[PDB]
Amino acid sequence: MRAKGISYDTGFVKNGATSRKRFDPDVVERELRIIRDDLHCTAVRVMGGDPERIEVAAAHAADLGLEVWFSPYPLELTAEEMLSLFADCAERAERLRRRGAEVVFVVGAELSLMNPGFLPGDSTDERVALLREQLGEVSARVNAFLGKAVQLVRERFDGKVTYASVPFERVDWAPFDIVSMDLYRSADRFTDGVRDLVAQGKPVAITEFGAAGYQGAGDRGALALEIVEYGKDGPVRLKGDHARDEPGQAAYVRELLEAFDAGGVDGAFVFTFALYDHVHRPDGDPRDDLDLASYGIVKVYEDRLGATYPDMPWEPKAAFTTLAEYYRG
């Protein structure tokens, strides 16, 4: 694998709510340094809904020598709002690319699930729930929007362009430089599917894959956040009492990385470094240990610093060790 990656949440924005209440650039710089030095990543997918935050993290990553996947990730935005976000992001991405950063631009993610207007539904829950013949219509709309968005981006940005798709969208990859797909294993034919994806010939990146950290979560693939009760601002509590299974999270990530290496992908981006508002509360009721549902490979505290990185408000989970070993060699 050429791009040994992880994604990095600078703050999704959903109805004005950020997923990352604190964005301290000194902390961001040190997290990205750990990602390079201790997770042995060569690339980072810098996600969010705030172009300035994405740009600050991407500039630190480039200054560290990391390949930057500049990755606006709109949530519940109209077409006009998405296009405006992409235009702003593409201008900043171009400024960075011109300074000599290696920058890939990602034109959104899973648009038919994350934003209205492709699939029926007023929320991602509604739209996912619809996965029980609309697929041609959904694919037509996604591809029509992507045709517009890619042209907008290429007017502003002269590097490689991709899109973090899901399989059912049936993206036309003709306008893109890289084929990117979000692939959760949930099991038998998996590596065969990866090889088919690689076979069309353009470099392939797996832009999103991972598991949460409770017992059984790897089975539930991309649906592991279904145990979370969400409120006005973010996660509030878990619906039931779940045991922690950090080894199972680590083993899921490693097995998928093995399947992607075997299948020949160009890049893979573990989802994810941290989900900062899914706080770890190890010494209380498990229903309040929001970190159990986190796809992050570190566990973030609300009120303490960690032991391994004593200036950091988080601690590695087992999956952090596993990724580091996998990417080291």
mmCIF file of C-alpha atoms in Angstrom:
data_model
loop_
_atom_site.group_PDB
_atom_site.id
_atom_site.type_symbol
_atom_site.label_atom_id
_atom_site.label_comp_id
_atom_site.label_asym_id
_atom_site.label_seq_id
_atom_site.Cartn_x
_atom_site.Cartn_y
_atom_site.Cartn_z
ATOM 1 C CA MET A 1 0.000 0.000 0.000
ATOM 2 C CA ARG A 2 1.302 3.330 -1.149
ATOM 3 C CA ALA A 3 -0.951 5.506 1.073
ATOM 4 C CA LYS A 4 -0.924 4.156 4.655
ATOM 5 C CA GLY A 5 -3.625 6.368 6.018
ATOM 6 C CA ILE A 6 -5.984 7.348 8.797
ATOM 7 C CA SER A 7 -8.766 9.879 8.798
ATOM 8 C CA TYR A 8 -8.721 12.866 11.130
ATOM 9 C CA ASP A 9 -11.862 14.636 12.327
ATOM 10 C CA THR A 10 -11.366 18.404 12.452
ATOM 11 C CA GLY A 11 -15.071 18.809 13.225
ATOM 12 C CA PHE A 12 -18.016 17.550 11.251
ATOM 13 C CA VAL A 13 -20.834 20.119 11.241
ATOM 14 C CA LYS A 14 -24.471 18.946 11.340
ATOM 15 C CA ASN A 15 -27.214 21.598 11.723
ATOM 16 C CA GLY A 16 -24.472 23.931 13.013
ATOM 17 C CA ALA A 17 -23.257 21.400 15.624
ATOM 18 C CA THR A 18 -19.549 20.554 15.558
ATOM 19 C CA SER A 19 -18.275 17.077 16.441
ATOM 20 C CA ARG A 20 -15.128 18.632 17.903
ATOM 21 C CA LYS A 21 -15.862 21.288 20.545
ATOM 22 C CA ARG A 22 -12.129 22.073 20.936
ATOM 23 C CA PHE A 23 -9.839 22.631 17.947
ATOM 24 C CA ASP A 24 -6.506 23.717 19.411
ATOM 25 C CA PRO A 25 -3.874 23.992 16.614
ATOM 26 C CA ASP A 26 -1.033 23.164 19.007
ATOM 27 C CA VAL A 27 -2.829 19.960 19.936
ATOM 28 C CA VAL A 28 -3.650 19.307 16.259
ATOM 29 C CA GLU A 29 0.000 19.634 15.259
ATOM 30 C CA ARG A 30 1.106 17.168 17.933
ATOM 31 C CA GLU A 31 -1.643 14.639 17.095
ATOM 32 C CA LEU A 32 -0.621 14.710 13.421
ATOM 33 C CA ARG A 33 3.043 14.253 14.448
ATOM 34 C CA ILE A 34 2.059 11.159 16.458
ATOM 35 C CA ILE A 35 0.085 9.933 13.465
ATOM 36 C CA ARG A 36 3.240 10.190 11.318
ATOM 37 C CA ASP A 37 5.871 9.062 13.873
ATOM 38 C CA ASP A 38 4.024 6.476 16.008
ATOM 39 C CA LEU A 39 1.203 5.220 13.769
ATOM 40 C CA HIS A 40 3.600 5.296 10.746
ATOM 41 C CA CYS A 41 0.958 6.828 8.500
ATOM 42 C CA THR A 42 2.085 8.301 5.204
ATOM 43 C CA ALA A 43 -1.207 10.044 4.453
ATOM 44 C CA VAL A 44 -4.053 11.599 6.380
ATOM 45 C CA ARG A 45 -7.638 12.221 5.313
ATOM 46 C CA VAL A 46 -8.463 15.592 6.881
ATOM 47 C CA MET A 47 -12.266 15.667 7.325
ATOM 48 C CA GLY A 48 -14.743 18.220 8.488
ATOM 49 C CA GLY A 49 -17.446 20.720 7.803
ATOM 50 C CA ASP A 50 -15.380 23.883 8.522
ATOM 51 C CA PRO A 51 -12.964 24.821 5.687
ATOM 52 C CA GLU A 52 -10.733 26.862 7.998
ATOM 53 C CA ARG A 53 -10.304 23.979 10.427
ATOM 54 C CA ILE A 54 -9.635 21.558 7.584
ATOM 55 C CA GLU A 55 -7.041 23.967 6.195
ATOM 56 C CA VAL A 56 -5.240 24.413 9.547
ATOM 57 C CA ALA A 57 -4.957 20.642 10.041
ATOM 58 C CA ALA A 58 -3.952 20.079 6.395
ATOM 59 C CA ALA A 59 -1.201 22.707 6.595
ATOM 60 C CA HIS A 60 0.234 21.087 9.730
ATOM 61 C CA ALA A 61 0.056 17.674 8.057
ATOM 62 C CA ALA A 62 1.833 18.933 4.931
ATOM 63 C CA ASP A 63 4.460 20.689 7.055
ATOM 64 C CA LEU A 64 5.048 17.236 8.597
ATOM 65 C CA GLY A 65 5.445 15.671 5.126
ATOM 66 C CA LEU A 66 2.166 13.727 5.207
ATOM 67 C CA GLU A 67 0.194 13.289 1.994
ATOM 68 C CA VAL A 68 -3.016 15.318 2.558
ATOM 69 C CA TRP A 69 -6.455 14.070 1.519
ATOM 70 C CA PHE A 70 -8.359 17.370 1.823
ATOM 71 C CA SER A 71 -11.798 16.036 2.629
ATOM 72 C CA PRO A 72 -14.882 18.256 3.194
ATOM 73 C CA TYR A 73 -17.538 15.925 4.560
ATOM 74 C CA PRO A 74 -20.862 17.790 4.360
ATOM 75 C CA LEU A 75 -23.706 16.590 6.566
ATOM 76 C CA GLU A 76 -27.364 17.603 5.992
ATOM 77 C CA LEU A 77 -26.408 20.327 3.499
ATOM 78 C CA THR A 78 -28.386 21.367 0.421
ATOM 79 C CA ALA A 79 -26.750 21.205 -2.994
ATOM 80 C CA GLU A 80 -26.062 24.974 -2.872
ATOM 81 C CA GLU A 81 -24.448 24.648 0.586
ATOM 82 C CA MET A 82 -22.307 21.674 -0.534
ATOM 83 C CA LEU A 83 -21.100 23.457 -3.659
ATOM 84 C CA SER A 84 -20.227 26.527 -1.620
ATOM 85 C CA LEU A 85 -18.298 24.366 0.887
ATOM 86 C CA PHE A 86 -16.422 22.615 -1.915
ATOM 87 C CA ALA A 87 -15.515 25.921 -3.622
ATOM 88 C CA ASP A 88 -14.071 27.357 -0.413
ATOM 89 C CA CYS A 89 -12.208 24.107 0.356
ATOM 90 C CA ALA A 90 -10.828 23.761 -3.186
ATOM 91 C CA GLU A 91 -9.328 27.253 -3.065
ATOM 92 C CA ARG A 92 -7.554 26.480 0.222
ATOM 93 C CA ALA A 93 -6.440 23.054 -1.024
ATOM 94 C CA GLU A 94 -4.927 24.718 -4.096
ATOM 95 C CA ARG A 95 -2.966 27.220 -1.970
ATOM 96 C CA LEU A 96 -1.463 24.284 -0.069
ATOM 97 C CA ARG A 97 -0.754 22.236 -3.212
ATOM 98 C CA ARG A 98 1.051 25.234 -4.729
ATOM 99 C CA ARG A 99 3.381 25.475 -1.751
ATOM 100 C CA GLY A 100 4.503 21.929 -2.620
ATOM 101 C CA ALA A 101 2.134 19.788 -0.504
ATOM 102 C CA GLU A 102 0.917 16.502 -2.016
ATOM 103 C CA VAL A 103 -2.853 17.075 -1.927
ATOM 104 C CA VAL A 104 -5.738 14.867 -3.057
ATOM 105 C CA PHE A 105 -9.147 16.580 -2.981
ATOM 106 C CA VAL A 106 -12.138 14.452 -1.811
ATOM 107 C CA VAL A 107 -15.443 15.921 -3.098
ATOM 108 C CA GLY A 108 -17.626 14.922 -0.130
ATOM 109 C CA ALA A 109 -18.563 11.502 1.206
ATOM 110 C CA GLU A 110 -21.520 9.118 0.883
ATOM 111 C CA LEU A 111 -23.599 12.027 -0.379
ATOM 112 C CA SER A 112 -26.857 10.106 -0.860
ATOM 113 C CA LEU A 113 -26.818 9.099 2.823
ATOM 114 C CA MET A 114 -25.196 12.179 4.403
ATOM 115 C CA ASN A 115 -27.191 14.931 2.682
ATOM 116 C CA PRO A 116 -30.780 15.373 1.474
ATOM 117 C CA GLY A 117 -32.005 15.232 -2.075
ATOM 118 C CA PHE A 118 -30.636 11.976 -3.548
ATOM 119 C CA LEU A 119 -32.587 9.402 -1.457
ATOM 120 C CA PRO A 120 -35.939 9.923 0.284
ATOM 121 C CA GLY A 121 -35.515 10.860 3.920
ATOM 122 C CA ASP A 122 -35.088 13.822 6.288
ATOM 123 C CA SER A 123 -32.091 12.360 8.133
ATOM 124 C CA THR A 124 -29.320 9.803 7.657
ATOM 125 C CA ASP A 125 -31.315 7.379 9.831
ATOM 126 C CA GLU A 126 -34.313 7.709 7.528
ATOM 127 C CA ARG A 127 -32.164 7.335 4.430
ATOM 128 C CA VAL A 128 -30.203 4.302 5.682
ATOM 129 C CA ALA A 129 -33.445 2.734 6.937
ATOM 130 C CA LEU A 130 -34.623 2.889 3.314
ATOM 131 C CA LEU A 131 -32.114 0.012 2.731
ATOM 132 C CA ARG A 132 -34.826 -2.626 2.975
ATOM 133 C CA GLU A 133 -34.992 -0.032 -7.828
ATOM 134 C CA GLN A 134 -34.548 3.546 -6.620
ATOM 135 C CA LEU A 135 -30.858 2.841 -7.146
ATOM 136 C CA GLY A 136 -30.772 3.956 -10.785
ATOM 137 C CA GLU A 137 -32.412 7.265 -9.820
ATOM 138 C CA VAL A 138 -30.099 7.730 -6.852
ATOM 139 C CA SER A 139 -27.064 6.952 -9.003
ATOM 140 C CA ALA A 140 -28.238 9.388 -11.703
ATOM 141 C CA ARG A 141 -28.598 12.183 -9.145
ATOM 142 C CA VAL A 142 -25.289 11.490 -7.404
ATOM 143 C CA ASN A 143 -23.486 11.408 -10.721
ATOM 144 C CA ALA A 144 -25.190 14.571 -11.942
ATOM 145 C CA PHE A 145 -24.226 16.411 -8.767
ATOM 146 C CA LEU A 146 -20.663 15.022 -8.852
ATOM 147 C CA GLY A 147 -20.325 16.143 -12.477
ATOM 148 C CA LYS A 148 -21.088 19.708 -11.352
ATOM 149 C CA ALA A 149 -19.002 19.529 -8.179
ATOM 150 C CA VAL A 150 -15.913 18.112 -9.926
ATOM 151 C CA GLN A 151 -16.023 20.856 -12.558
ATOM 152 C CA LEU A 152 -16.325 23.486 -9.808
ATOM 153 C CA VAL A 153 -13.368 21.946 -7.970
ATOM 154 C CA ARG A 154 -11.141 21.566 -11.029
ATOM 155 C CA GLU A 155 -11.606 25.248 -11.867
ATOM 156 C CA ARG A 156 -10.048 25.983 -8.467
ATOM 157 C CA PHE A 157 -7.721 23.043 -7.796
ATOM 158 C CA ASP A 158 -5.177 21.398 -10.065
ATOM 159 C CA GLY A 159 -4.414 18.186 -8.177
ATOM 160 C CA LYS A 160 -5.971 14.753 -8.101
ATOM 161 C CA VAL A 161 -9.698 14.562 -7.298
ATOM 162 C CA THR A 162 -11.720 11.724 -5.864
ATOM 163 C CA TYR A 163 -14.928 11.053 -3.972
ATOM 164 C CA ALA A 164 -15.594 8.797 -0.973
ATOM 165 C CA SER A 165 -18.412 6.666 -2.423
ATOM 166 C CA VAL A 166 -20.465 3.789 -1.157
ATOM 167 C CA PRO A 167 -20.945 0.745 -3.448
ATOM 168 C CA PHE A 168 -24.654 1.198 -4.144
ATOM 169 C CA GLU A 169 -24.188 4.757 -5.536
ATOM 170 C CA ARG A 170 -22.686 3.328 -8.786
ATOM 171 C CA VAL A 171 -20.418 6.314 -9.353
ATOM 172 C CA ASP A 172 -19.152 7.115 -12.834
ATOM 173 C CA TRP A 173 -15.423 7.311 -12.157
ATOM 174 C CA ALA A 174 -14.579 8.930 -15.534
ATOM 175 C CA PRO A 175 -14.242 12.469 -14.090
ATOM 176 C CA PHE A 176 -12.053 11.352 -11.150
ATOM 177 C CA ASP A 177 -8.344 10.563 -10.809
ATOM 178 C CA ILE A 178 -8.751 8.023 -7.990
ATOM 179 C CA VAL A 179 -11.545 5.541 -7.251
ATOM 180 C CA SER A 180 -12.451 5.798 -3.553
ATOM 181 C CA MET A 181 -14.912 3.642 -1.692
ATOM 182 C CA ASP A 182 -16.094 3.225 1.899
ATOM 183 C CA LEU A 183 -16.055 -0.480 2.698
ATOM 184 C CA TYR A 184 -17.232 -2.006 5.932
ATOM 185 C CA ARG A 185 -17.015 -5.765 6.174
ATOM 186 C CA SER A 186 -20.128 -7.184 7.808
ATOM 187 C CA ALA A 187 -17.744 -11.359 5.159
ATOM 188 C CA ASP A 188 -16.982 -14.286 2.837
ATOM 189 C CA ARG A 189 -16.417 -12.746 -0.616
ATOM 190 C CA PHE A 190 -14.720 -9.581 0.680
ATOM 191 C CA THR A 191 -11.204 -9.749 -0.778
ATOM 192 C CA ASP A 192 -12.646 -10.854 -4.129
ATOM 193 C CA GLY A 193 -14.737 -7.681 -4.161
ATOM 194 C CA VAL A 194 -11.638 -5.599 -3.408
ATOM 195 C CA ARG A 195 -9.795 -7.194 -6.331
ATOM 196 C CA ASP A 196 -12.722 -6.423 -8.674
ATOM 197 C CA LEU A 197 -12.612 -2.832 -7.486
ATOM 198 C CA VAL A 198 -8.846 -2.604 -8.099
ATOM 199 C CA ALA A 199 -9.225 -4.262 -11.517
ATOM 200 C CA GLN A 200 -10.882 -1.282 -13.225
ATOM 201 C CA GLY A 201 -7.402 0.245 -13.268
ATOM 202 C CA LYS A 202 -7.496 3.666 -11.630
ATOM 203 C CA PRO A 203 -5.744 3.715 -8.224
ATOM 204 C CA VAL A 204 -8.194 2.643 -5.496
ATOM 205 C CA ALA A 205 -8.370 4.082 -1.975
ATOM 206 C CA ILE A 206 -10.536 2.747 0.849
ATOM 207 C CA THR A 207 -11.470 6.111 2.309
ATOM 208 C CA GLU A 208 -13.488 4.813 5.314
ATOM 209 C CA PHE A 209 -13.451 1.481 7.167
ATOM 210 C CA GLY A 210 -13.302 0.621 10.853
ATOM 211 C CA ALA A 211 -15.155 -0.685 13.877
ATOM 212 C CA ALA A 212 -16.442 0.577 17.215
ATOM 213 C CA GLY A 213 -15.093 -0.818 20.438
ATOM 214 C CA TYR A 214 -17.899 -2.754 22.105
ATOM 215 C CA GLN A 215 -18.449 -6.511 22.081
ATOM 216 C CA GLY A 216 -20.005 -7.527 18.779
ATOM 217 C CA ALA A 217 -19.464 -4.148 17.112
ATOM 218 C CA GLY A 218 -17.385 -5.494 14.226
ATOM 219 C CA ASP A 219 -20.361 -7.595 13.089
ATOM 220 C CA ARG A 220 -22.501 -4.408 12.812
ATOM 221 C CA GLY A 221 -19.964 -2.846 10.392
ATOM 222 C CA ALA A 222 -20.912 0.753 9.660
ATOM 223 C CA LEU A 223 -24.038 0.664 11.884
ATOM 224 C CA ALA A 224 -22.241 0.515 15.242
ATOM 225 C CA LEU A 225 -23.369 4.041 16.223
ATOM 226 C CA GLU A 226 -26.937 2.655 16.500
ATOM 227 C CA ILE A 227 -26.401 2.065 20.243
ATOM 228 C CA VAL A 228 -26.075 5.854 20.822
ATOM 229 C CA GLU A 229 -28.817 8.237 21.928
ATOM 230 C CA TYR A 230 -28.030 11.610 20.321
ATOM 231 C CA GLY A 231 -29.179 14.997 21.528
ATOM 232 C CA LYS A 232 -29.205 18.651 20.516
ATOM 233 C CA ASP A 233 -25.395 18.810 20.244
ATOM 234 C CA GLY A 234 -23.999 15.300 19.954
ATOM 235 C CA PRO A 235 -24.001 11.893 21.678
ATOM 236 C CA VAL A 236 -25.718 11.856 25.085
ATOM 237 C CA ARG A 237 -25.683 8.240 26.288
ATOM 238 C CA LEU A 238 -25.645 4.631 25.111
ATOM 239 C CA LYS A 239 -28.970 2.758 24.837
ATOM 240 C CA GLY A 240 -27.762 -0.354 26.701
ATOM 241 C CA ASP A 241 -24.942 -1.842 28.769
ATOM 242 C CA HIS A 242 -22.139 -3.119 26.503
ATOM 243 C CA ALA A 243 -18.819 -4.724 27.282
ATOM 244 C CA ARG A 244 -15.619 -3.166 25.943
ATOM 245 C CA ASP A 245 -13.773 -5.178 23.271
ATOM 246 C CA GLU A 246 -10.656 -3.307 22.235
ATOM 247 C CA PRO A 247 -9.007 -6.503 20.886
ATOM 248 C CA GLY A 248 -12.034 -7.047 18.598
ATOM 249 C CA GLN A 249 -11.801 -3.481 17.269
ATOM 250 C CA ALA A 250 -8.079 -3.978 16.614
ATOM 251 C CA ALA A 251 -8.597 -7.343 14.931
ATOM 252 C CA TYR A 252 -11.298 -5.957 12.624
ATOM 253 C CA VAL A 253 -9.036 -3.104 11.442
ATOM 254 C CA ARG A 254 -6.120 -5.477 10.885
ATOM 255 C CA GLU A 255 -8.134 -8.057 8.944
ATOM 256 C CA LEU A 256 -9.544 -5.400 6.612
ATOM 257 C CA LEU A 257 -6.082 -3.918 6.066
ATOM 258 C CA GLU A 258 -4.924 -7.435 5.187
ATOM 259 C CA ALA A 259 -7.743 -7.788 2.642
ATOM 260 C CA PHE A 260 -6.943 -4.411 1.086
ATOM 261 C CA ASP A 261 -3.231 -5.192 0.824
ATOM 262 C CA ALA A 262 -4.088 -8.594 -0.684
ATOM 263 C CA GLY A 263 -6.542 -7.001 -3.140
ATOM 264 C CA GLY A 264 -4.007 -4.430 -4.313
ATOM 265 C CA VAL A 265 -5.448 -1.110 -3.141
ATOM 266 C CA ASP A 266 -3.358 2.039 -3.504
ATOM 267 C CA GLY A 267 -4.454 3.574 -0.189
ATOM 268 C CA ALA A 268 -6.489 2.916 2.921
ATOM 269 C CA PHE A 269 -7.714 5.363 5.598
ATOM 270 C CA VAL A 270 -8.724 3.828 8.929
ATOM 271 C CA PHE A 271 -11.902 5.404 10.318
ATOM 272 C CA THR A 272 -10.828 6.964 12.505
ATOM 273 C CA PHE A 273 -8.180 8.618 14.708
ATOM 274 C CA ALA A 274 -10.643 9.985 17.328
ATOM 275 C CA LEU A 275 -14.302 10.903 17.782
ATOM 276 C CA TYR A 276 -13.704 13.646 20.299
ATOM 277 C CA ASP A 277 -17.197 14.077 21.689
ATOM 278 C CA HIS A 278 -17.658 10.302 22.248
ATOM 279 C CA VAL A 279 -15.924 10.655 25.579
ATOM 280 C CA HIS A 280 -14.386 7.762 27.525
ATOM 281 C CA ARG A 281 -15.761 7.389 31.069
ATOM 282 C CA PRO A 282 -14.135 4.158 32.256
ATOM 283 C CA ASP A 283 -14.959 4.553 35.990
ATOM 284 C CA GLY A 284 -18.732 4.976 35.769
ATOM 285 C CA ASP A 285 -21.871 3.422 34.327
ATOM 286 C CA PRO A 286 -21.146 1.751 30.931
ATOM 287 C CA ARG A 287 -24.145 3.548 29.394
ATOM 288 C CA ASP A 288 -22.180 6.791 29.944
ATOM 289 C CA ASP A 289 -18.963 5.450 28.401
ATOM 290 C CA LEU A 290 -19.664 6.975 24.984
ATOM 291 C CA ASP A 291 -16.225 5.820 23.791
ATOM 292 C CA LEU A 292 -17.575 2.252 23.537
ATOM 293 C CA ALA A 293 -19.388 3.338 20.351
ATOM 294 C CA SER A 294 -16.456 5.352 18.995
ATOM 295 C CA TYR A 295 -14.697 4.284 15.790
ATOM 296 C CA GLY A 296 -11.703 6.205 17.073
ATOM 297 C CA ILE A 297 -8.569 4.206 17.784
ATOM 298 C CA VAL A 298 -7.793 6.502 20.738
ATOM 299 C CA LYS A 299 -10.173 6.991 23.697
ATOM 300 C CA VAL A 300 -10.750 10.679 24.511
ATOM 301 C CA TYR A 301 -11.226 11.868 28.119
ATOM 302 C CA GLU A 302 -13.302 14.829 29.178
ATOM 303 C CA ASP A 303 -11.415 15.558 32.397
ATOM 304 C CA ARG A 304 -7.880 14.033 32.346
ATOM 305 C CA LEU A 305 -4.695 13.579 30.340
ATOM 306 C CA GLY A 306 -3.440 10.221 29.158
ATOM 307 C CA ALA A 307 -0.505 8.143 30.396
ATOM 308 C CA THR A 308 1.215 7.220 27.119
ATOM 309 C CA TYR A 309 1.203 10.775 25.699
ATOM 310 C CA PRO A 310 1.047 12.742 28.928
ATOM 311 C CA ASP A 311 0.093 16.044 27.301
ATOM 312 C CA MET A 312 -2.780 14.499 25.286
ATOM 313 C CA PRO A 313 -6.423 14.278 26.389
ATOM 314 C CA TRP A 314 -6.667 10.678 25.120
ATOM 315 C CA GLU A 315 -5.105 7.239 25.334
ATOM 316 C CA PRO A 316 -4.350 4.675 22.598
ATOM 317 C CA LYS A 317 -6.673 1.718 22.318
ATOM 318 C CA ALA A 318 -5.515 -1.741 21.237
ATOM 319 C CA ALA A 319 -6.303 -0.796 17.617
ATOM 320 C CA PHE A 320 -3.684 1.968 17.831
ATOM 321 C CA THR A 321 -0.960 -0.600 18.617
ATOM 322 C CA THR A 322 -2.212 -2.844 15.815
ATOM 323 C CA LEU A 323 -2.270 -0.072 13.207
ATOM 324 C CA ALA A 324 1.214 1.086 14.230
ATOM 325 C CA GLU A 325 2.581 -2.436 13.815
ATOM 326 C CA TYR A 326 0.774 -2.969 10.512
ATOM 327 C CA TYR A 327 2.031 0.304 8.975
ATOM 328 C CA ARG A 328 5.569 0.000 10.409
ATOM 329 C CA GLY A 329 6.297 -3.134 8.379
#
